Structure 1
Amino acid sequence: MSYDVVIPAAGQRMKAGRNKLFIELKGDPVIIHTLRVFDSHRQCDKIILVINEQEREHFQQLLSDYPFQTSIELVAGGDERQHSVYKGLKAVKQEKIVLVHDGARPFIKHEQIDELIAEAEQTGAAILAVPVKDTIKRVQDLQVSETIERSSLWAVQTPQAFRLSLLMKAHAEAERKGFLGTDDASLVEQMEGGSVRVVEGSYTNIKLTTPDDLTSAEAIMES
């Protein structure tokens, strides 16, 4: 059915007003492009944007500049990405499917979200990923220590979709024992019996941090 989306926007870090999500892409902040995807999606009930308190005013101003039909809440985060995601998930008001999504990934398609909601509802946890295409090596001090075996390796994207109860439990367990995950899926993996499934996404679902990313973004738009 429907979902809430939590987007961590605390910078896991820049000074107030200088969030990487405010970098303009064809004249609109990256975050705007991302927000419009979830706004136009019929099954997205609400957007939870997890922020640093200092940047609240900047986000408020930005949202008044760009109004949306879909409800958007600014929820204060913490000092790490995981802590922030969890404070976000604490603002979901009933049991339902929850997505967690990178603000700087504006090219997610409603098709992919739909497929991810189906899996999360079916089995509890799902992530978007694509096959790794390049050889991967582990390297100590610019010296190759090994070549990682490529056959079944996937590059992980967002969103990641979960039953709220499940992801909440995975966050609580992790926090109670001081485990620091990378992405949300790794918290579920860390639980006993915890299981996560993959929906294959698209190579266009890129994350925009650096200026070369903008250039690649501007070409994905125009196309």
Structure 2
Amino acid sequence: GEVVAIVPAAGSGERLAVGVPKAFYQLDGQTLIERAVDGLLDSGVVDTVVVAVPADRTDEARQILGHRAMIVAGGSNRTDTVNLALTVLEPEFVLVHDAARALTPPALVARVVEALRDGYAAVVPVLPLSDTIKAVDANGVVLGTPERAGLRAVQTPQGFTTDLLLRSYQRLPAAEYTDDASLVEHIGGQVQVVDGDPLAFKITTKLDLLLAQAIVRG
């Protein structure tokens, strides 16, 4: 069975705010997108990579990546982007992996694929939450504190049988998903977790960038 990894890299980088769309920021001489793609390939369990980038950077993305990946244009939000990439299509398994998780260890990638090959139809890597999490309303008032031990922070790559992912993305007009496993949960698919990895952290803030720099220079 073949495994295709889709890499959403079409965001604007508006929150990190380092003056360029995040995927194209050069971390110690390599863009996040190149690093993320290399990690997927180094896992030894990914056969094809499809990267989705801002429409005005498709040429740039090919210049960077060469034959490491197929390049397509992404969309106005992460969900839209994944949907466009999915259009490219049939492999047995599909991974969806944030370019922003550029330092993900290849072994995590392999761990996700192994769980798919173990027969889990949908797989996400998770970590325990360091912070207490609270539900908060629009006025800054706390609604309550869900039990932390019952919650997990979820990373990527998220892995799926291709059939299930396709059906999930095909199927709430006013939602609204922050990851891919959400669509699978929505249509009733069972999602299994595996242990994530601190190194698969998402480069989100300038502190995350500081840490990524310390890791790669270290």
TM-score normalised over the length of structure 1 = 0.86
Look up the match of 1:183: 179
Look up the match of 2:212: 217
Look up the match of 1:131: 128
Q: CA deviation at 1:120?
A: 2.4
SS for the counterpart of 1:129 is: strand
CA distance in 2, matches of 1:18, 1:222: 21
CA distance in 2, matches of 1:111, 1:218: 21
Deviations 1:75-130 (A, max 9, x none): 122222112102212213x1311100000102222222122112223121000110
In the TM superposition, 1:32-51 aligns within 5 A as: 32-51=34-53
Contact 2:4 2:49 in 1 (8 A): yes
In the TM superposition, 1:107-186 aligns within 5 A as: 107-121=103-117, 122-140=119-137, 141-173=139-171, 179-186=175-182
Instruction: Identify unmatched segments of 5+ residues in structure 2.
Output: none
Contact 2:23 2:100 in 1 (8 A): yes
Q: How many residues align?
A: 212
Residues 145, 166 of structure 1: alpha-carbon distance in 2 compared, 3 angstrom cutoff? same
Contact 1:24 1:30 in 2 (8 A): yes
Q: Percent identity between the aligned chains?
A: 33
Deviations 1:15-70 (A, max 9, x none): xx93211212112211121111122232211111112222222223323xxx55x4
Q: CA deviation at 1:11?
A: 0.6
SS for the counterpart of 1:148 is: coil
Contact 2:3 2:91 in 1 (8 A): no
> Does 2:87 match 1:95?
no
Instruction: Identify unmatched segments of 5+ residues in structure 1.
Output: none
Look up the match of 2:7: 7
Q: CA deviation at 1:178?
A: 6.0
Contact 2:40 2:109 in 1 (8 A): no
SS for the counterpart of 1:182 is: coil
Look up the match of 2:83: 86
Look up the match of 1:24: 26
CA distance in 1, matches of 2:179, 2:101: 15
Contact 1:10 1:52 in 2 (8 A): yes
CA distance in 1, matches of 2:204, 2:148: 26
Look up the match of 2:58: 56
Deviations 1:131-151 (A, max 9, x none): 112211122323322112112
State the Cα RMSD in Å: 2.1
* Residue identity in the other structure for 2:43: H
Q: CA deviation at 1:196?
A: 0.2
Provide runs of 4+ in structure 1 moved above 6 Å.
none
